[PDB]
Amino acid sequence: EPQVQFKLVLVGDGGTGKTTFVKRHLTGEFEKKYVATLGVEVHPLVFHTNRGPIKFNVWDTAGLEKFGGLRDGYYIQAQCAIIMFDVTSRVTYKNVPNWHRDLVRVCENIPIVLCGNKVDIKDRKVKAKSIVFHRKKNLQYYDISAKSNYNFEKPFLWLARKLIGDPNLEFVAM
């Protein structure tokens, strides 16, 4: 059970829920406020698994342009990524190809998950039958909710399986 750590890059339009998702994993709290991330904040996330601990260094990046910081410069040396959008905002899914573009132009062969967040909300605007971008880009897609705990660990599980190279990896508590 040695300590492997991976640079994970978290990108998406602002207000998608990037920071709220990481904070709930880090502390269990759900943040209701929208406080834009300036530049990048790096938060270590440790998962315990049936084959020993895995640490993701989450580079939580800013989605508003005015707060971009070094933008694609933060992506150097990333080993995986999550792209987030908000299923209550079409603009976010439309800009997902742009996040994907900037990412793969810096890290070509890295496992990437795409997440549609906020599926708890009743007025869903990006319909499940519409989300197809990940197919041809060979991405995983998970519908998730930072608020309801829906598919909450799935993105990390997949990345962990793909990075450790064990299809049967599972997350354990302590």
Next chain:
Amino acid sequence: LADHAARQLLDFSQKLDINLLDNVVNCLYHGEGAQQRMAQEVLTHLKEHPDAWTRVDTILEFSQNMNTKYYGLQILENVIKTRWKILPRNQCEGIKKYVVGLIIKTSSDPTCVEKEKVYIGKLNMILVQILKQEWPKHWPTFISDIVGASRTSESLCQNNMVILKLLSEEVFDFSSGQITQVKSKHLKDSMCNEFSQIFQLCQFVMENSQNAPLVHATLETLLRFLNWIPLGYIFETKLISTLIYKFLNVPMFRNVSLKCLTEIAGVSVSQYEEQFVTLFTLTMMQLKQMLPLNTNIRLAYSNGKDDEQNFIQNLSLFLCTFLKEHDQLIEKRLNLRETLMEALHYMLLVSEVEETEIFKICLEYWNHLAAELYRESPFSTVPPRRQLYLPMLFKVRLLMVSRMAKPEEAAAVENDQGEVVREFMKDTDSINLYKNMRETLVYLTHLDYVDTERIMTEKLHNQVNGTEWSWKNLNTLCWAIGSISGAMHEEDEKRFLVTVIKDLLGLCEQKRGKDNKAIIASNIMYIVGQYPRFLRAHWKFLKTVVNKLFEFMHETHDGVQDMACDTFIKIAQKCRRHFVQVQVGEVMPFIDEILNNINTIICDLQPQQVHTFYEAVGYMIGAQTDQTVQEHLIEKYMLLPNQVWDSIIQQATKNVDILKDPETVKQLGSILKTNVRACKAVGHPFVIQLGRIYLDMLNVYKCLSENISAAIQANGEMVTKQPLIRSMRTVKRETLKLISGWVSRSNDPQMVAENFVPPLLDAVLIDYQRNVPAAREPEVLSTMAIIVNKLGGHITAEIPQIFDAVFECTLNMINKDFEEYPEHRTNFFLLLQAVNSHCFPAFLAIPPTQFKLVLDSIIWAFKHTMRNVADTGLQILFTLLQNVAQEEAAAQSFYQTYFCDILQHIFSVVTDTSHTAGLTMHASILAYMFNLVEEGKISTSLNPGNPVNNQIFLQEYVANLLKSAFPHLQDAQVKLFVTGLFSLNQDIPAFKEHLRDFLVQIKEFAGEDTSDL
């Protein structure tokens, strides 16, 4: 390391300390906390500095690491993106020669091509940015040059392929929001104009090169061109045959090629019938080589390396794309039947792979096939297309039954008070997967009822004999059996259901263990739940079922109680009319028997289960047409909650202090939950119950609200997390849900207004006002919102009193920052929007100063970055403008007072990169306002430019506003943009794009020129 040391990089009078830049850059990728933030801050300031590009040479010449160098490149890219058009022509040419220079060198070094390929990538991007800015006009020989260097040298060719992919991408894929429409068009046309030269180079490399990496790049570049190039190049060359013979069957080229073939396959045109046929034919011939038809693709995928998994995905994409678009092409040709069935074979095999994303792709095809055959003909147990498919349609039916997804998705969710509640998710990926599977199976069932039943009969037999027995398997089958409800004729389905139920009951017998019986009974419950039509025809079965459900509400084995409650609500809504009419062979209607026995039915349920139980009975009571009868039903229905309620109220008159007792408070919450669920089902008629409790419910709300406030005064929001406080907030929230829930469903507005609205003032509204900020319940604002949208005219007279309680003290909580009290901001604007939509006269009755506070707050809303808040604010403003215009009387002094002011505020948000999600509304509001002037506003917008007509004054004011805020804009840019606000005020999409063009221009510096056409 010290901030003042790292800031040394910003001096610009000293020579750059390369060692220091390396440490900072190193702090960026490897440092923690505050030191990394400082790096990030210093490096951002440096990257943005107008003169940073001067040192880029220094960086690339002396920097030890590639991190620093990459950063060097980021600086050069920014200068080309922001100030290429204001650099002197001589510095431009120098930058061109420096970049192609550096590209030649690094892509000529073989170490570089192996290791620093990210760096190479960035350099390529640098060049492309130069091309986007001035390629056709200031570099006319570019394409000829790139082609000539490419034929001159293999290393140049390989990289030049990347450059062309990037260019194609930037021009054809990512131009929106980065480049103006006119420049974008110009770029596309210029690339179209020189494509043949480029195509020839790709053809040359494909047909002749033995450089594997070069061929691969060429194919990666071709894949991007396929998106835009004229079809002639795709279909009237040997491209298809080249891809198939040369590349498709070579491991290292297999994925690119297949992806290319997929883009070709998706083209939908009548002109190239033959070439589509060849593409299918030839591809199938190669697939038979690399992937024999007897491969276990499920195992292959399970066990495969990364690019084998890719390969199988791409194969399902190719087959799905090709057949969805061109299956009739293969259908009509008799000598291709076997190859068509083979393609169906592959789809079936790939359908076994255990990965949702791939399954979904296969399912999209199965859904298409089933839809088509059912459009051709919907009849059962023979038309021409169905004829071709009949050999394998059983295998699709079998696939659907075997892999049917879970149809409902139940979760445990914590609310804002720390209760875990059982919710059901709506419209998720996995629910949409279920619905597609149902539709497929339902279509295929219509084509042959017997075949579906056959398959189900057999899966069931293998439950019974233990062959295929498991909780998972039985679930799947039962989900499937439920999925096809409605697809059979009523006579067939009765016979079918009876067999299914008998066999599962038999298996309930056969299997021992509480666990197993719970699983089997849950399935039975699920199925009968999905067949209301059967229940409606056979009253004796419906009665048995309901009673059986009542037995299950006393089994505390995990899951059984939830299933009984879930099934009971399904059946109650689907069959409600059956509970209220006297059934044949019956004394009373069933609802009477149910009501007389609630006390025994629910004695062992969990509170949440009780709530669902009452909801279910609510629907039955809802369906009783006669009013006086319904009242007696409700009286009896509410009897048990009313007892506990009354008793707690009596104790509370005796001593207000039990209202602090943990158990009393849980219980009040649980009683109110019951009232809310009952009202949700019953609707308007629940007025009789609401009225009984109204004044007592408001009084407990008021005490609890005061208790919460006082506790926060004494020990802050830490006291708020406390359990007791939580369960008091529950009561307030359920109280408000109950009021808003009934009001929404009321249809006697005069009544609601005179009868229920008045008492809210002292109990809720003034209580909110007197509450300490952190104790004020955001749901107060939402309830008023709901109330105002329902009453409208009936509540206009009371807005003054409502806003005196809530308008100012709320504003004051949310007007210091954009972030705090998020739910207050959301709900407060929803209330404003309600008043503005439904009670507009109230806004006219108030004095100008008061109305000014209202507009100020509307304006404050659309300046939010919480998109929901901003969008409501924008809609409010739009609705207000339209309302003001209704009366000529106030309209013109509104225009005179506020028109220009509103414009400036809209402009400040249109021109901020943070608000681009508002574009549609920004466009609508701006277009409406500009249109208002260009057709006629009677009063001068400027009081003393008595001469300038409003339209002339607006052009000068807006232009001046824009020159003011963006001084680097050239005069012609401002004029052209202002003119457009008038020209395009009838076309919101074009107006929208006009704004987007403007945002591009404000982020760059142009000099004494323009993109004309």
